[PDB]
Amino acid sequence: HHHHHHMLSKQLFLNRCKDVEEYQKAGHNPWPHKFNVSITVPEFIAKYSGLEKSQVSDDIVSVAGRVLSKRSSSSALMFIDLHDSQTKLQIMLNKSAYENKEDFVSLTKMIYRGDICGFTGHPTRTKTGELSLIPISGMILSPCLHMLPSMHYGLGDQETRFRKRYLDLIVNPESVKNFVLRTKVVKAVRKYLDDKGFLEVETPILNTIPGGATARPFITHHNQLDIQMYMRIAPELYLKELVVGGINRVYEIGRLFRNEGIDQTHNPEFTTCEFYMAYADYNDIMKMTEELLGNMVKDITGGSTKLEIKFVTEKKMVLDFTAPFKRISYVHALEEKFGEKIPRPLDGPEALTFLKKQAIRFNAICAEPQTTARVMDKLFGDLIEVDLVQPTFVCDQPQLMSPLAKYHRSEPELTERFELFILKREIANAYTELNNPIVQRSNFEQQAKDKAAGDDEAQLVDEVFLDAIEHAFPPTGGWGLGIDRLAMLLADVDNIKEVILFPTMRPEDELEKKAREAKEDAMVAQELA
Amino acid sequence: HHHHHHMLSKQLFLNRCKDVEEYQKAGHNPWPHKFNVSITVPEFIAKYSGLEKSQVSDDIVSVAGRVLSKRSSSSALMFIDLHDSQTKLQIMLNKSAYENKEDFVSLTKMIYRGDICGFTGHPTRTKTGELSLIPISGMILSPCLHMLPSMHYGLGDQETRFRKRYLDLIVNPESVKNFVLRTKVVKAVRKYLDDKGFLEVETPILNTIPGGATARPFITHHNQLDIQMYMRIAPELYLKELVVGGINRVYEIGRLFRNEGIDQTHNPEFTTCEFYMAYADYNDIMKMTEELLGNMVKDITGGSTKLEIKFVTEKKMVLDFTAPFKRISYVHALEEKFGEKIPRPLDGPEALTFLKKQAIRFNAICAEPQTTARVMDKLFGDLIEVDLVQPTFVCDQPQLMSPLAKYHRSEPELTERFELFILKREIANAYTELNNPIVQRSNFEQQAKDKAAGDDEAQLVDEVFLDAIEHAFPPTGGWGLGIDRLAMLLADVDNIKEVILFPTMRPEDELEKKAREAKEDAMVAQELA
Numbered sequence A, B: 001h002h003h004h005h006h007m008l009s010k011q012l013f014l015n016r017c018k019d020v021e022e023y024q025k026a027g028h029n030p031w032p033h034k035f036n037v038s039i040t041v042p043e044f045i046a047k048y049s050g051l052e053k054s055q056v057s058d059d060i061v062s063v064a065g066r067v068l069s070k071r072s073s074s075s076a077l078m079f080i081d082l083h084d085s086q087t088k089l090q091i092m093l094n095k096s097a098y099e100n101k102e103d104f105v106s107l108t109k110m111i112y113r114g115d116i117c118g119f120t121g122h123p124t125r126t127k128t129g130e131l132s133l134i135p136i137s138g139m140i141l142s143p144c145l146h147m148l149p150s151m152h153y154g155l156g157d158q159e160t161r162f163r164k165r166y167l168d169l170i171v172n173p174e175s176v177k178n179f180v181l182r183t184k185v186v187k188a189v190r191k192y193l194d195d196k197g198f199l200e201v202e203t204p205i206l207n208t209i210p211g212g213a214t215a216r217p218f219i220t221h222h223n224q225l226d227i228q229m230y231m232r233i234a235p236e237l238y239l240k241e242l243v244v245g246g247i248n249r250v251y252e253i254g255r256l257f258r259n260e261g262i263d264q265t266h267n268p269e270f271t272t273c274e275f276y277m278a279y280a281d282y283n284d285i286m287k288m289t290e291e292l293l294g295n296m297v298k299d300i301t302g303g304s305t306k307l308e309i310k311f312v313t314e315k316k317m318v319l320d321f322t323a324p325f326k327r328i329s330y331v332h333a334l335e336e337k338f339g340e341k342i343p344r345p346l347d348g349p350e351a352l353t354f355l356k357k358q359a360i361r362f363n364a365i366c367a368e369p370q371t372t373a374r375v376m377d378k379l380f381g382d383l384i385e386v387d388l389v390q391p392t393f394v395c396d397q398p399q400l401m402s403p404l405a406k407y408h409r410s411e412p413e414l415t416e417r418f419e420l421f422i423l424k425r426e427i428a429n430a431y432t433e434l435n436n437p438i439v440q441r442s443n444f445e446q447q448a449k450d451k452a453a454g455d456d457e458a459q460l461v462d463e464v465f466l467d468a469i470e471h472a473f474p475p476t477g478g479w480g481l482g483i484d485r486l487a488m489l490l491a492d493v494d495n496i497k498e499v500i501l502f503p504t505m506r507p508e509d510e511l512e513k514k515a516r517e518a519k520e521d522a523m524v525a526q527e528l529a
Ligand SMILES: NCCCC[C@H](N)C(=O)OP(=O)(O)OC[C@H]1O[C@@H](n2cnc3c(N)ncnc32)[C@H](O)[C@@H]1O
Pocket: A212, A213, A214, A233, A234, A235, A236, A258, A265, A266, A267, A268, A270, A271, A272, A274, A426, A427, A428, A429, A430, A431, A433, A477, A478, A479, A480, A481, A482, A483, A484, A485
């Protein structure tokens, strides 16, 4: 002393192994191959809740789950809380009702909190009103060799929560309801597109030229081909090539990879849905977005207004998903709050200096390089996005920020594009697709200028794609939504790790490890005293 | 001369750009923003095929597609083959029926083969019996700037086919039927699991320890965390952790990455479906596989026997998907054809030497290292897999090949596992999952031995996973199927590139480039002469 930091836990593990070893020598198999579960406990509850007090069904069913509680009134009567599908069912181990008495005492002695057990017997409702099962037989299906945390645990410490999801799902079962919700969202999306003739496709994740958006790629290497490859930033280009190929409507709900910073709204690998629809424009896509999200909100309320939160309490607000969404222009709203209305060449030097000095006038300065696009981005970010709470379509961005968006049909130096903002966050991005190969090539020129300027987040010229769209590319509307963030919205959480099963965590130190473990037995030891 | 290799093509491109430029100066927009398509040509055909010869409907509809043919009987009568959704509709441009005569002559002169056009007019059926549309108005939606290949093209040369999928989909539209089929397969799978309470989840693609199967990973690096990461070999471990967490039934249809050789059955990035089902064994999973695939075959015939091919012709055979599938044992069939029946310690040296000499006796030798598992793999591969044509369950492999499969409940030195073989190919792999943490750890030991032996395709010990399963892991059945290969089977193709939209191709040389282009104008020039 005072070393040996994770003493009690090691001791407990060793002793548990010893226990299951003794149990195995006694003629009991701790890990049975097959146990037939005749009914799940939600089905159990749904079927036998009609039972009155002291009533016992003649039916014999078999359930199985994780023991979260083990209490006994005597040696002949034990009560177990068996959890399955995030639902609780009581097991009333009554010795007089158990067929094998020896097995009864051995099993009831051996059962440890955390053990996966199975039981076979009669459904009932006790005098206490607790729906239960009285087992004729029972067995341990998988012994727990460590100490399960109490419910709840780690609710504050996000680290230990998201480092050991397999424990968090057990001690914080409510969290499951998030992920379920997520899978609904996805499914909904699929349906909405599948019913419109869209073809769900799969485009390569490994590339040679990262394009489709503005970011920095993960770099890998293929051995046999002896060549560097890049994990995709966006599936945009390939999907467009599919549209050129003759498949009018395509979509992909896939994993995108971006080597950037990690926060409450950014995971290095995330999930988006991108679709492309021939002979459509961003108006049709606006309507489709309103319809999809509005329906998605109505199938959980079912009004198109959703109740929401707001430190960490329950204060209420409302998100208005009623069609139509509010529509504002990127340059017009920026002009309105500025007082001055921008010089006319937005690409020129004059306007660059002007943005540079309305920047200091509002304390919104950009990290190098300070190109027009980046300065405008920090401007729009620190000034108007902070007030975009209700579902809002931010439309008609300039071209120097939109290389893959088609020219606006009425407004000079603007593009046919919108970004959907909800709760100060970008959820969706959509274009009227640029199908002019000449302008596309010159736009890739115009990106090369930027990545010469120091920017390494600009889009490189893809020659194959250029060839494809040079072979005639239909007028098309394009759409991209962040599944993770929409999930965040609908699940009412302000941390993206709440809707990602295994988020990317910084590998904990030896100090953080030592610490954490030391805490674990600090409290174990305190419980022992 | 004789240089300037891609002369005519360059000239054609330049001239086409000049053409659309002149067209734009004449007051016509080559790339209109929005054209409203009132009806698709399959819907068109479905609705107006009832028309008799010389009959004209009073309805006015608007269609749009790609011009694949342009012929004319006179200057007042032109015939276009407009393709949409891999379907042909004739456009009869009759000048007397066109509203804007000037627009008629300008448009009919400007239209080039490959152009995306839109038309608005009356449906009809001509004297020739050809279902058509007589346009009142029309316009070019997107001009084609290169020469589209004739139908068909490249049917032999797989290279140019799979290098430019956007062209192949146009000139070989039948190929589309493959990918459609694929998306059905996937969907089917989803349904089959969704109806059984399975939760469709997403596990990380970026790892720190590659596990779940036996292969070699792609290596990448995260900047902010300053750490090497690995693209997943299999989602097995994480899904298992989800099962430990309390989610009894999970599945993921995702992208797996393996840095290996490329052939007719191997793409560096492929798609698999993995599910895990608590309180099940590999028997139940056998039945589920029979049911799923049998149903999948019955929903395209609808008998459970499928007609198949077999040099490159149409010779017929039959795949028997009727339940039950034929079941053979890994060691018993290997014994039957051997004559001798293996020594009893399969891990020992004696049996190693024995396999080493029944190997030369059948000319089946292994590349270094020649471990027991690899020798047995080359043995089983070159000897019995060559005769597994009909759907066959190859069951009960030894443990030295199955580190994540549970011990067999009756047979020593064997595991509860099967591999589904169809047409000499592994399509599915399934276990009764190992839930014994001690044996799991010792098995990871037993893999470390191999990767010390020279093998770098063995599985490394995952401590987090070990912790998870040490926290009690329910008896579980696991399943993994190759979507790409199943697609190959159902689409009747012997090349995996036929069911992957953008397969990984070796970046063509300067010589291969020069060649290909030179061929293109060799034939263009021959056509000009
Ligand atoms: N032709 C129109 C195409 C529009 C899609 C475009 N290729 C595109 O990728 O556009 P992005 O904007 O790059 O991504 C759009 C949405 O992705 C979400 N998102 C982006 N980065 C994310 C991250 N690190 N973590 C989680 N989610 C993230 C956002 O909700 C965004 O609305």
